[PDB]
Scaffold this active site. Structure first.
Site: not given
Ligand SMILES: C[C@H](CCC(=O)O)[C@H]1CC[C@H]2[C@@H]3[C@H](O)C[C@@H]4C[C@H](O)CC[C@]4(C)[C@H]3C[C@H](O)[C@]12C
Ligand SMILES: C[C@H](CCC(=O)O)[C@H]1CC[C@H]2[C@@H]3[C@H](O)C[C@@H]4C[C@H](O)CC[C@]4(C)[C@H]3C[C@H](O)[C@]12C
Lengths: 355, 356
Positions: B316-317
């Site tokens: 997600d980062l």
């Protein structure tokens, strides 16, 4: 059965006249000041007069008074005025202030409370960030002042020994920062670096394991989250004095080194809740006023009477009292690591009922 | 389709004991890390690395033959790129690389592989959630040099994830491991176990530059303690200090020995790196714990390593980074203004972005 709400911190002299005795107390300290043996008493006088001129100039340079006392009392009052409306089971809430080094001192406010009829009292340390040097000393004196003025435990104490991210706090520091950002040209705004400045600490306190540096950092990061990291920022440290190494990026040097490199620069009194000598003097007159880049050096408003802030303080005491605990579960750790010639050796004995 | 490059970065460690000398020479030659002399830094590095190589070499044999950093890095890159392929079809295929500042494959090595593979878009993914100039700043400076030296056409468009102290998955993964390690303490003593978040330390003159690292580590610590509801006492402490200079403290070793006879338990949490390495398998496992008299109430939290919540959080980062067109955070220009280097980036907007 009235309830004592006692705002605590190290204090400042409300008037220039109270500067000698304030300083004497500080240099008479057991714990922090290097003890000769029994001889703080003596030698503390011999330095208070030595340093009373210079610090007196300073308080006169800001209007002849430390704003700590008025702002402490004022906060303590609106807190109880919401408290008495928000926790009826606890009312009446009687506000008090007790400073470790200024007036009224801890003894001076204990006896007032004893003549006043308080049965349970909340030691509400006005530092959102515990350090043993601040909220430790304020507690260790309270213990001395409990064994003296109250050897049969008439008043039952608890302590709000930290609150680094109370949301009234976090939120009041935003808005303030945003509204102080609007004083900047506007094409610059988002590149003003928010310099969060906390009073520093000797490295020898830091290296004991003191809770203060990390707890300050938790507040900074939480602010910048609500600010959605619009701006650059750094947590830096002010008020270094004396000969030993202190903590981490001295605030004044950082502002100099950055001055000719930044479109602007905002100072934030991250680790105290009202104006005092550190804001009106060290920053306004000392870091900002004595500087070429002063036109791009702005300081964010101190908390003081911020409505949002005081309400956040309200719900904090509200939830401290109603969940019926005497101290956070960091506090035994704090006191096991702190260094002090005369320490609380059992916070179970110090807080709670013992009649 | 051309692949977009996802490059995990950190100092690295020697996969095998025979790489120890090269790795140490690389590290002692980096003037951004240990400033000794403008001119002769790299001869002096040669000596020091000849000297200290057998001591470091034995330490690695004592933990099993080398650093597991490279293995875990490459495994995290691969698992993350395979989430992105389902998550970020616009920039698929995502091809995983690793690039270490002192270990192999070095950043020069990994760059050359990327040019050869046809990568045109690449994210420098610093594996340190906490920016420090002597790690990530130094790594960025290395990448600039490899930009100039191997890629003057600017074939590669670079961005950098330069920090991520409170990525959700990272917070969660740490909280799951702390809770899990705490099952191994009885129960009447569980809430009394002291969580010692142990981060690698900084020389104080680095701290005093305004480096971002100590405060950012503390953000992770507090966020983890929020997820745990402050059930336990905790302190953030610092390890790996060496030698004469004053470093940031308190020191993990001396805090644990002071606390030893006073505590029901200590847990050491490797808060500032994401896989096992020398710090955890040697300094903590064998030193602070193996050699302590309280060693049976001393435990270390498992490293993140292959934790899925951590890997999903990294995915997600990156996904959020790609879908944002931020070349780097708003902190990076400040980092570089305060960092100390004899060959700094100077102008991060030339470093990252298209300049083809
Ligand atoms: C000749 C050179 C200084 C020349 C100058 O700029 O004045 C000096 C500076 C530091 C020295 C080096 C450092 O002292 C480290 C090493 C020490 C050993 O005694 C020999 C090789 C060794 C690598 C030295 C070779 C030589 O003495 C050096 C390189
Ligand atoms: C190799 C050298 C001395 C070894 C020895 O005592 O024999 C030691 C002393 C200080 C060490 C450094 C510091 O401890 C801090 C860093 C910690 C990281 O885990 C590895 C690199 C890291 C940068 C270390 C690399 C290296 O092993 C160093 C430089």
């Amino acid at each position: 059965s009235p309830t004592g709400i006692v705002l605590m911190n190290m204090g400042g002299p409300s008037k220039v006249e109270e500067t000698y005795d304030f300083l004497y107390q500080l240099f008479a300290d057991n714990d922090l000041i290097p003890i000769s043996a029994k001889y703080q008493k003596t030698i503390a006088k011999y330095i208070a007069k030595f340093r009373t001129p210079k610090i007196e100039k300073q308080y006169r340079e800001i209007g002849g008074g430390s704003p700590i006392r008025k702002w402490s009392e004022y906060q303590a009052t609106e807190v109880c005025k919401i408290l008495d409306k928000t926790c009826p089971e606890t009312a009446p809430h009687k506000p008090y202030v007790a400073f470790r080094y200024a007036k009224p001192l801890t003894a001076e406010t204990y006896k007032q409370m004893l003549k006043d009829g308080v049965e349970k009292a909340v030691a509400f340390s006005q530092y959102p960030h515990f350090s043993y040097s601040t909220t430790g000393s304020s507690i260790n004196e309270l213990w001395r002042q409990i064994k003296a003025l109250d050897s049969e435990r008439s008043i039952s104490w608890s302590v709000i020994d930290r609150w680094p991210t109370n949301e009234g706090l976090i939120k009041a520091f935003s808005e303030n920062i945003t509204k102080k950002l609007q004083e900047f040209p506007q094409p610059v705004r988002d590149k003003v670096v928010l310099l969060f400045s906390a009073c520093s600490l000797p490295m020898d306190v830091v290296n004991t394991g003191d809770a203060y540096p990390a707890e300050v950092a938790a507040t900074v990061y939480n602010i910048m989250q609500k600010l959605k990291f619009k701006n650059p920022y750094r947590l830096v440290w002010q008020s270094q004095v004396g000969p030993k190494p202190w903590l981490g990026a001295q605030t004044a040097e950082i502002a100099e080194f950055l001055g000719p490199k930044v479109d602007g620069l905002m100072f934030i009194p991250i680790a105290f809740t009202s104006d005092h000598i550190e804001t009106l003097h060290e920053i306004d007159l000392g870091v900002i006023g004595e500087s070429e880049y002063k036109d791009k050096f702005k300081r964010c408003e101190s908390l003081n009477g911020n409505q949002t802030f005081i309400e956040g303080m309200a719900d904090l005491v509200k939830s401290h009292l109603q969940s019926n605990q005497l101290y956070s579960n960091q506090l035994p750790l704090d006191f096991a690591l702190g260094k002090s010639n005369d320490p609380v050796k059992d916070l179970s004995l110090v807080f709670g009922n013992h009649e």
